[PDB]
């Protein structure tokens, strides 16, 4: 009945940002020392409450969102950010109460022929609302000329591949990001510390 963080952090394969994975965690005891007393992580910035004190707090649900981005774009995973990833793929709200954990995964997610299994959205008619997921592949209309499902000039496929290669610079290398969201809503606390 311990909370299955291993399934999220230790997954063989991660989601793409535009189709970011969300794991609901409920009805269990969460040992937060496993994640936070670790030397793995390259980025560990909480915004709501401090991770040390995590064990003394208690929540309705916790949401573990997971995805892969470039190192350069880990900065965009934070409240009030803007950019391709924050606006079109994964947006956190300004009242975010959680933790952003990121780590370098060049050894896992880069291949010499290019790793095209991780995509992102580069075009969208409006900015995402916080925690919106857009999985549409509708051709993006970039001009006044309409796209009736056909790609051409000013009509672009909305998704792009990272093509992660091992030779890339650290800023261009893949990073696995898990974002922990602690909501304490109108319902009882169903996840808590030891």
């Amino acid at each position, epitope marked *: 009945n311990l909370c299955p963080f291993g399934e999220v952090f230790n997954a063989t394969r991660f989601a793409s940002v535009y189709a970011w994975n969300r794991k609901r965690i409920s009805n269990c005891v969460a040992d937060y020392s496993v994640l936070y007393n670790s030397a793995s992580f390259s980025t560990f910035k909480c915004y709501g409450v401090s991770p040390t004190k995590l064990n003394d707090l208690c929540f309705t649900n916790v949401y573990a969102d997971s995805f892969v981005i470039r190192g350069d774009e880990v900065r965009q995973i934070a409240p009030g950010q803007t950019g391709k990833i924050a606006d079109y793929n994964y947006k956190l709200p300004d009242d975010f109460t959680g933790c952003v954990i990121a780590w370098n995964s060049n050894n896992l997610d880069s*291949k010499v022929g290019g790793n*095209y299994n991780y995509l992102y959205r580069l075009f969208r008619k409006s900015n995402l609302k916080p925690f919106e997921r857009d999985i549409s592949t509708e051709i993006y209309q970039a001009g006044s000329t309409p796209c009736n499902g056909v790609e051409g000039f000013n009509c672009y*496929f909305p998704l792009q*591949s990272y*093509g992660f290669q091992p030779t890339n610079g650290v800023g261009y290398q893949p990073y696995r990001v898990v974002v922990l969201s602690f909501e304490l809503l109108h319902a009882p606390a169903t996840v808590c510390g030891p």
Partner: antibody, heavy 129, light 109 residues
Framework: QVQLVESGGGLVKPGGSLRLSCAAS????????MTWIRQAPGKGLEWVSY????????YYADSVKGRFTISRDNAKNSLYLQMNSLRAEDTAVYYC??????????????????????WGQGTLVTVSS | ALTQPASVSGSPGQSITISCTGT?????????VSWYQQHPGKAPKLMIY???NRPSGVSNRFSGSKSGNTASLTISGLQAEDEADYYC??????????FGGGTMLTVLG
């Protein structure tokens, strides 16, 4: 180190069935789209079919549709082509090839899985009475 | 299904181009045109992908271009070892790949 070896070719009579296999080494088989491409003696390349990582995204050429079944075993690192109702026009070298880029986890990955490297040596299939 | 010239020939050292014509639904619709060279008794070798990308190791004499519904493979400074069959392929609107009929390139002299 990366290696693609296909077997199971030979003689088959018109209307018979034959099963080709391709064994892979040196890369994580589970991550890529896999193809069969064929070439008749003295003739050009003809793309046959390709399969995604799970096996749930499959595309066939019109010449081959309704007769061939592509399939994959990730635990055994093997690709298979089941050919049925063979005719003489199916006589060809059947090459097994891997998409140079890994894009197998998505149905959308056909976009980034359409240029092929490495290839195997090929297997000769003769449809004759 | 993609249209290639059956054969072309150039003199050594010259520049030579091989055209591959498709339709709106393939070469004209996407930037996923690949080129392969094939020598006698060998498997095809990828020279160009995504219209113009060259894999690492392929000679810089090979380059790829696209315009309209016609892709082109161009070889600068022909050499006798470039004499082979050349095939273009592209991704289709039905998520297939189709190849052209192939082109036997002859080096004169």
């Amino acid at each position: 180190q990366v290696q693609l070896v296909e077997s199971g070719g030979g003689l088959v009579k018109p209307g018979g069935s034959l099963r080709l296999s391709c064994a892979a080494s040196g890369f994580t088989f589970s991550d890529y789209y896999m193809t069969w491409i064929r070439q008749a003696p003295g003739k050009g390349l003809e793309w046959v079919s390709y399969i995604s990582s799970s096996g749930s995204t499959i595309y066939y050429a019109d010449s081959v549709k309704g007769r061939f079944t592509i399939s994959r075993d990730n635990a055994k690192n093997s690709l298979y082509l089941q050919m049925n109702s063979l005719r003489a026009e199916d006589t060809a070298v059947y090459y097994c090839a891997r998409a140079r880029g890994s894009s197998g986890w998505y149905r959308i990955g056909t976009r980034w899985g359409n240029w092929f490297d490495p290839w195997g040596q090929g297997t000769l299939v003769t449809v004759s009475s | 299904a993609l249209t290639q010239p059956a054969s072309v020939s150039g003199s050594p050292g010259q520049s030579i181009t091989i055209s591959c014509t498709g339709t709106s639904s393939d070469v004209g619709g996407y930037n996923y045109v690949s080129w392969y060279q094939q020598h006698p008794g060998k498997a095809p070798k990828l020279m160009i992908y995504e219209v113009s990308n060259r894999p690492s190791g392929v000679s810089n004499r090979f380059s790829g271009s696209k315009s309209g519904n016609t892709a082109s493979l161009t070889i600068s400074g022909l050499q006798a070892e470039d004499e082979a069959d050349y095939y273009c392929s592209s991704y289709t609107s039905s998520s297939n790949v189709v190849f052209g009929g192939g082109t036997m390139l002859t080096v004169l002299g």
